Amino acid sequence: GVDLLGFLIITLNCNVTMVGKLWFVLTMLLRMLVIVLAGRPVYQDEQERFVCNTLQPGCANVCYDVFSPVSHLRFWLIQGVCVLLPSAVFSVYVLHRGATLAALGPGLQVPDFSAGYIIHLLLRTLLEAAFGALHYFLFGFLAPKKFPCTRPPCTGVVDCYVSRPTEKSLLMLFLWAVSALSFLLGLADLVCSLRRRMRRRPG
Amino acid sequence: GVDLLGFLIITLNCNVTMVGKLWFVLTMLLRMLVIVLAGRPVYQDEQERFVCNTLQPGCANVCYDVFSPVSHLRFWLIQGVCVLLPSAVFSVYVLHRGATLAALGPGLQVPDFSAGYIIHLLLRTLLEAAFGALHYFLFGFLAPKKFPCTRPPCTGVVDCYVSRPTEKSLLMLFLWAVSALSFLLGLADLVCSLRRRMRRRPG
Amino acid sequence: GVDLLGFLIITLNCNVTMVGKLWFVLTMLLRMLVIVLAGRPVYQDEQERFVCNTLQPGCANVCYDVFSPVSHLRFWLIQGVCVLLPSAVFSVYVLHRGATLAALGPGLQVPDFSAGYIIHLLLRTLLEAAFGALHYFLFGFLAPKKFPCTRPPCTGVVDCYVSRPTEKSLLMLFLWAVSALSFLLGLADLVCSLRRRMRRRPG
Amino acid sequence: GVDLLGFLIITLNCNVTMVGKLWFVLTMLLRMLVIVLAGRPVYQDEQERFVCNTLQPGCANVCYDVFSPVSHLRFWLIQGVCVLLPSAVFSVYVLHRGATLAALGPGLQVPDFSAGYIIHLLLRTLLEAAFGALHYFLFGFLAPKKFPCTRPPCTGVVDCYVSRPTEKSLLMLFLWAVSALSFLLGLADLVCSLRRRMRRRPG
Amino acid sequence: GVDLLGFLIITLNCNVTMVGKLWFVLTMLLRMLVIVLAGRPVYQDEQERFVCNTLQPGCANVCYDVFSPVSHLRFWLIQGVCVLLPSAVFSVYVLHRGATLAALGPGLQVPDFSAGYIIHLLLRTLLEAAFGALHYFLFGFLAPKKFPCTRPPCTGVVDCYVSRPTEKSLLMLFLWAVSALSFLLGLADLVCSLRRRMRRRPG
Amino acid sequence: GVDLLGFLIITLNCNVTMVGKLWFVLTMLLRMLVIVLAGRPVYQDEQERFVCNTLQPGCANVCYDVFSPVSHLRFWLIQGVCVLLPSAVFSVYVLHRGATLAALGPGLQVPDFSAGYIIHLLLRTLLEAAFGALHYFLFGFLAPKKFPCTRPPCTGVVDCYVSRPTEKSLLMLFLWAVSALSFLLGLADLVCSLRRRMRRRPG
Amino acid sequence: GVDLLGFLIITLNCNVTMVGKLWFVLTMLLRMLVIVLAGRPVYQDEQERFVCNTLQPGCANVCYDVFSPVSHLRFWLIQGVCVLLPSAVFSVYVLHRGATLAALGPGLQVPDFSAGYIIHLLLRTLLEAAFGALHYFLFGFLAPKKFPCTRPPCTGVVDCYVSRPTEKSLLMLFLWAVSALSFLLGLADLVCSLRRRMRRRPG
Amino acid sequence: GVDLLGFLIITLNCNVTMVGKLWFVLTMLLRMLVIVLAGRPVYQDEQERFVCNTLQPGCANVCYDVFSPVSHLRFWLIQGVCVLLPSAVFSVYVLHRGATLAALGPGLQVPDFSAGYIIHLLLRTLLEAAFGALHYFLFGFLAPKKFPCTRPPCTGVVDCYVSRPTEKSLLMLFLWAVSALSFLLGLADLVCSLRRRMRRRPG
Amino acid sequence: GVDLLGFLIITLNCNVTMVGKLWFVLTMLLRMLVIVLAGRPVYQDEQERFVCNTLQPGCANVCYDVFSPVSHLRFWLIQGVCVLLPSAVFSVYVLHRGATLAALGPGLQVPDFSAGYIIHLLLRTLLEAAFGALHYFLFGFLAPKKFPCTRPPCTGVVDCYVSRPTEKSLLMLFLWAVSALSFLLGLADLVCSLRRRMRRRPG
Amino acid sequence: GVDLLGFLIITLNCNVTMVGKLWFVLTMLLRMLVIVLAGRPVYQDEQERFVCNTLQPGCANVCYDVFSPVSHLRFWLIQGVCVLLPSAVFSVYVLHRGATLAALGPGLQVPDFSAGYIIHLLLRTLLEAAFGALHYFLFGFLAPKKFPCTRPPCTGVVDCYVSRPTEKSLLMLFLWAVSALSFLLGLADLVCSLRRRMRRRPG
């Protein structure tokens, strides 16, 4: 006889490639940790110290609301969460199918979930291009230092100053590089899994 | 002989359907995580930057206390916590009953807790309609931008400005869509479990 | 032969009743989670926006130090932590005794720690009445809206305004109801365990 | 045949006494949790609301930098983290030695790491007296309410007010009592282990 | 027959030395915990209480943006996260290779991953010297107390005061000592593993 | 022989009636003295303490410039000066003609300038009705206490408060009564001089 | 022959008694000069430095408008100007009658205007009692130091401070004494002129 | 015999024409009195209420100094004083010559100072055209309402508001009309004196 | 025959000595003119710019009221007015007696009012010593620069600064010297008039 | 017979030259009038609008007290008053001597006070050079625009701005020119009187 906690691990550590195993480590310690630990402190006083040259109440609220409809900390969070989602559905499906197969019963006999891996890789790859295009079209590459605001109740043209315009642009480049490097890790894995699956098919 | 840590998972991963396994994954990574990580920073300076057009001390406190008796961040937290509660009582009951059955002893012999799943699904479904109706009757769909306040000690009619009226209304739509999508996942599982239980009953 | 990771669970899931397993689930998802996630944001600007009608430096500090000697957020935290303490000593004792009994060796033979459960239930029950009485005698049921302060260096009688006097009183009722409901869960379990232990004793 | 996940627990739950098992439970839920959850909110506006009687820029920074060179929140953190360190080295050593002994192979045969427990107890005991003496010589027992400051660029003698001088002194007593109670738990365990080891040694 | 949850630990607990096991304990409880728990509160009001001697709006933002282009809290976080990265790739590689070796099958037969440990140690050692040199060339050893700023729109020379210049310099020394002590732990392990590998090679 | 300083006085003290002599005394000690000594102090802080409910620079100047285009202190001065002008031309003409008549030479022989007195009385009488009508149509009878102002750059409707609205209205009544009483003094003199001149004309 | 510039002086210097000549000197250098030179500077910042304990605009105006409806500087000026008026009508009547009597012609022959002096003295005496009674009933004897104000838009009871409450009360006593001393100078002259006129009348 | 206080008046009231006697009366009661009594109160807070849109000290001083180098109240004073000067030298010369002629002694014999009157009229006429041209080239006809200021230390372009821009422009027209009317009074007198002097010269 | 306007001047310019004629010229152009023209501008902002180190309303009023109960500008005015009073009573008495003596009639016959001059000189001399002693005992010789104030509602000891402490002390010396010089002018005249009157008295 | 009011003028208008009569006219209408009417308004806010770059109370008073120990308005007043003093003593002496000479009695017989005119001219000339030298050594020719101040309690070097630095320097030039022109009028009169007196002296 054999146990079952073990068999539940060989099945999971036989359908994930080494590249996909290292992608999971790289894009959760350098991507999901920097956003939480180093992103929140930087973007805490974005409105508190967004200083405008006015004294009329309500002008600084309207000017900041026009300046940044949606912050890019929230955009980073949503983009990073929605990429880890295809990797959880497949993990839950593998555990649901593998543990429901040993209950009935019959040099192991690990099932082959290789067709369900290429689809998840394709969806994950397609989910990064759209979020990269939206990121480029929404925020650009570097943060500005000044903002002209003319909305009421402000009279004339008011000038407002952005807080921390340099460090915020230094974190943008780091996150852009991390995302670009992680995008090619799923492209070097798909073109290998596809090339391997057809090879192991005599006919 | 066989172990019983594998038996304690096969029992649990035989009473939960694939739809129910997928609902658990979706409504904790896109619902319970966005509320904590992305909801708290947005609603931090709701009173600090709630600027009113007055100079008399105590008017800004009174006006804000009438503007928002209960914030919708707390409402989101309470609504999301009370939906995961029926899913924990059933999980604890399954573990209490399963491990108390192998102690006495006698191609497995997994117990069938299918009657205790429909009831938990019904309670969970009924707990969402009430919280949706209350949400619609309390906060609406979009956030306002201005507030007229006439309570004492303010003299006349004072105007106050809401902080971040646009991003707050963008997060409401995302959470509304997530809740609406999760409500139909428990409705597509109940009408399948009920239809399956009667099928597997010759008489 | 049999394992011991399994034997270490039946020993633990044979000395805890269903009511005691359900109390553990309820009073950490609705009590220890609301305090941490929904209590900290509410009580963050209690002194920052405790506005008094004065201009002399140091009057607002003195007045606030007399208004609230100890906050009830810390009271809630200490009261909730000290109730989970009797449940941890018993858990650690059960694991210490159970794993030291299978080392020597000889239809299982699970030990009976039923006498050590009633004592922990009694201590837990006695620890709630004292904290309820202290809570009633210290903070009451609802939060006030204004405070008169006459301490030096303030001249005359100064009036100060409490921040968020309505939502703070709405959370008080929720926590009071949760505590009252959890107090009767340990009373319906003790009067059942005591009545069962004497029944299973012919003589 | 037998497993070795259980064998890795008998070894660990045979070298730690009951007093040492309950010390870990007590001085982690009442010491490391109150510091994190109840200490951070109290000491968040120590400088923001350290109000001095001056209008010259830079005087309030200089006065506060002389009032508190190092805060006692960080002192509590460092003192509590350096006491849990001897308990982790011994735990890692026990697992390193135990799992390297069953690989070679030969009513169990649990190894006896009793000599490596008294040394860790002695180091832990010696690490508390020094931190208690430093705590007494640095911060005293109660928090003050006022501070006289004469450093430049302030002219004359300025008076500054401490924020929350009462609650801060109420938390000090609780933490002092917790530390004093935990110090005698390691003294009642050492004088028992030493007395037991010599007893089980005929010669 | 034998399990494989046990075989998955000896494989991991036979390729890591005692020095490497104690290094992991040391520079994660005294390095990654002090940065998070004790570093964030200190560096929270670095810009809020960076007081400059001016009244023109926008001067305090410009002066602070030149004072600190990048904070050293973020530098500490990035430096500490990039050193734990080589230790995770090796860990995941060991688990990927070990569990893929028992599936095929044939006094244990644990594989020897001793060659893949020296390279990871070398990379980890090389990653510390660069970050130490950059730390020296960027921030120095102690924090200043004043800053002269002449950038527009400020007129003349303005003087600004740094918040908490003493405690910030006390945490610098603690972290410098921790890093210096951890650097020699990987140097005492490499020159031992290298000297041992050649010894166990007759030819 | 006789002198001519004396003859220069009988000529002047024979063409002015008793009513016209008392009018000069009354409307120079109660009219031209109250305006200078009691009017200037009252109207000194009319703009300095004209408080509006706004904080935007330039709104208080614009609102005051529309509230009072021309002050009534200046109106009182101009009206009181232009009434004393007809009385000076006649006085200078009498002295020019009288001293140019005794140079050539021949119970005195005082010349009769009775025709040149009725014309000056008529002009003086006609100069009061126009200034009374203008005063009634411009300022009214009493001073207001509040002013609504909506001119730019003020946003919305602003309320401004008039300084000393009661005493300013108490001086208005005194000056109105003085002017009304002085107007009938020139009407009781003209209808007497006209009735006397025709009587002393047999033919 | 004789001149008439001289005859115009004996006529005036034979109808005014020594007491009446001295009264004009006294209550014109110590009464009409102290009011102008020493009264205006004291009452210049009566409203500018009338400090009230409020921040709402418009409260300090309405409070001062109720504190002092009419100032006593204006009252002093009006009272002092209305007493010198009876002394000017008699003076101009004497010159009008005297210069119109020498034109027609016949040890001088100065006319006797003794009957027209008693009536002017009586009117002057009667004009002082009324203004003394009004002064007593309006302003009292000493100036206050504080004022309670409850008029809207002020909230609650506000306390305001009077500027220069001591010097203003020192000038009041000086002016009261001057007026009281001047009142008895016209009473010692009337009871002498009346007693002399009847004496020089044999029949 | 005759006196000479009279002879000193016939001499003076025989060399001044009726037009010249009337000009003297008009341009000191409507010109020299309005400037002093009505011009000083208007131009008292020209700098106090010259509000600029800036917060940097020293900008409001330089902006006002550039706005008005020399005020037109001082210009009015100097222009009006320098026109009365030619009328005083001639008056002093007539008195010096007339009283030095009767000392030596011989139907009066009044001297003829007609040649010294045309020259003074010519100088007075020439002194008005230059001051009118300078007034036109310096201040214009109406007062502005706003001023743009860019001098250092002000940053950018600042806008400042003029106090009382309407009443100040109403006084300008009154003074311009008075000056224009007085200029033609000296032109209607010169062309008459010149035409009369040549007529009374047979040869 | 002779006139009596001249006779009214011989009488007055025969009872006043040359020293008494020059005293009137000196102590009216250098004493009564400097006080009015140069004293009022200096003492105009004595309270407006009496800056105290406090922020509580009402403290600066009571502190200034205690500082200067009576100003020395008013003291100078009252002291200088009360010295010119004895010189006016004698002047009015001389004109009253001289014009009443020529009416009755009989190398002139000027009356001798020499006994009424020594008495007025004695009273004037006695009126200066008292005012000098009071001036010395009240204000001293030089003005202070700082004032400590502890009256309520001020808390502690407040420091206030006097405006223009140097120029005010420069005017004090000038006025002291003028008064001291004028005091000896009336002493050099009395000891000469007394010595002359007894000489012109044979018996 | 002759009068004496006429004799009192020829005596006075025979000892004053035409140049001396013209100097009197010029240096009271262009010197004593511009100082009073045009000098007081300019120097009214010299301290109110003397803006320094500081916030510490008491620094602006100390800095202004060192900037201008004595103002030049008071210097102008004192210098102009002390020059008219020699012209009043001579005038009073001429009237004292002339009216005391006709009382005793004997083509007039006017006395010759020519020796007492040169002495007064010499004293007046000598009183101008000293005040010109002091004026040059004290204030210079033009007014500054900025002032550096380092006196305590000001910290560092403070910059202060002078109010109206341009118009104040324009009035200085006008007054300098007036004084310089008036100084040569007394020099062209003395060198003529001295040359004439010696001519009219045969021996």
Side-chain angles (χ1 to χ4, degrees), chain E residues 143-194:
Chain E
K145 314 208 153 202
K146 274 177 85 153
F147 186 65
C149 176
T150 93
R151 290 264 193 291
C154 325
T155 81
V157 164
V158 195
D159 265 304
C160 308
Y161 288 86
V162 178
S163 115
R164 295 174 209 230
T166 284
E167 178 164 27
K168 262 165 225 203
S169 94
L170 277 181
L171 178 75
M172 263 176 179
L173 289 177
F174 178 86
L175 288 161
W176 255 111
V178 160
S179 308
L181 158 72
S182 97
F183 174 80
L184 322 159
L185 267 181
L187 228 51
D189 189 11
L190 165 68
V191 314
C192 163
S193 318
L194 252 178

Side-chain angles (χ1 to χ4, degrees), chain D residues 6-42:
Chain D
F7 180 76
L8 223 53
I9 307 167
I10 309 135
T11 304
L12 179 77
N13 165 151
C14 272
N15 282 289
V16 186
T17 56
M18 192 40 207
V19 194
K21 265 189 197 92
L22 83 83
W23 170 93
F24 181 75
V25 159
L26 269 148
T27 206
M28 163 97 72
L29 190 92
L30 278 164
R31 184 142 177 218
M32 275 279 118
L33 217 59
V34 189
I35 279 169
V36 161
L37 293 179
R40 156 85 153 142
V42 174

Side-chain angles (χ1 to χ4, degrees), chain F residues 120-138:
Chain F
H120 117 89
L121 285 168
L122 245 173
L123 290 170
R124 178 172 96 211
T125 278
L126 285 178
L127 268 179
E128 313 230 11
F131 265 106
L134 277 184
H135 187 7
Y136 164 60
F137 275 113
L138 252 171

Side-chain angles (χ1 to χ4, degrees), chain A residues 173-191:
Chain A
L173 289 177
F174 177 86
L175 287 162
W176 256 111
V178 161
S179 308
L181 158 78
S182 97
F183 173 80
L184 321 159
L185 267 180
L187 228 51
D189 194 8
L190 164 67
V191 314

Side-chain angles (χ1 to χ4, degrees), chain D residues 109-180:
Chain D
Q109 210 49 52
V110 181
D112 165 324
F113 310 108
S114 101
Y117 195 64
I118 303 174
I119 320 239
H120 118 89
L121 285 168
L122 251 163
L123 290 170
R124 178 172 96 211
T125 278
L126 286 179
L127 269 179
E128 316 227 20
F131 266 108
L134 278 180
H135 187 7
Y136 165 50
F137 274 112
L138 252 172
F139 305 102
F141 276 99
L142 306 148
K145 314 208 153 202
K146 274 177 85 152
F147 186 65
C149 176
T150 93
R151 290 264 193 291
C154 326
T155 62
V157 164
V158 196
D159 284 290
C160 309
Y161 288 86
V162 178
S163 115
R164 296 175 210 230
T166 283
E167 180 179 10
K168 262 165 225 203
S169 95
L170 276 181
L171 179 76
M172 284 201 198
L173 289 176
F174 178 86
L175 287 161
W176 256 111
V178 161
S179 308

Side-chain angles (χ1 to χ4, degrees), chain F residues 45-76:
Chain F
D45 53 34
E46 33 161 353
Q47 185 184 21
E48 169 203 308
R49 278 194 84 88
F50 181 82
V51 166
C52 294
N53 199 342
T54 197
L55 296 166
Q56 158 88 23
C59 175
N61 273 21
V62 175
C63 286
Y64 175 83
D65 199 34
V66 192
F67 171 55
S68 101
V70 54
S71 181
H72 23 19
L73 184 65
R74 258 63 82 181
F75 178 87
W76 283 331

Side-chain angles (χ1 to χ4, degrees), chain E residues 70-73 75 134-144 172:
Chain E
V70 57
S71 181
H72 23 18
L73 183 65
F75 178 87
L134 279 169
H135 188 7
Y136 165 28
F137 275 112
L138 252 171
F139 305 102
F141 275 98
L142 306 147
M172 263 176 179

Side-chain angles (χ1 to χ4, degrees), chain F residues 180-198:
Chain F
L181 158 78
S182 97
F183 173 80
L184 321 159
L185 267 180
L187 228 52
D189 193 17
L190 164 67
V191 314
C192 153
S193 319
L194 261 178
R195 204 199 274 182
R196 151 148 81 237
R197 151 184 201 79
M198 318 190 239

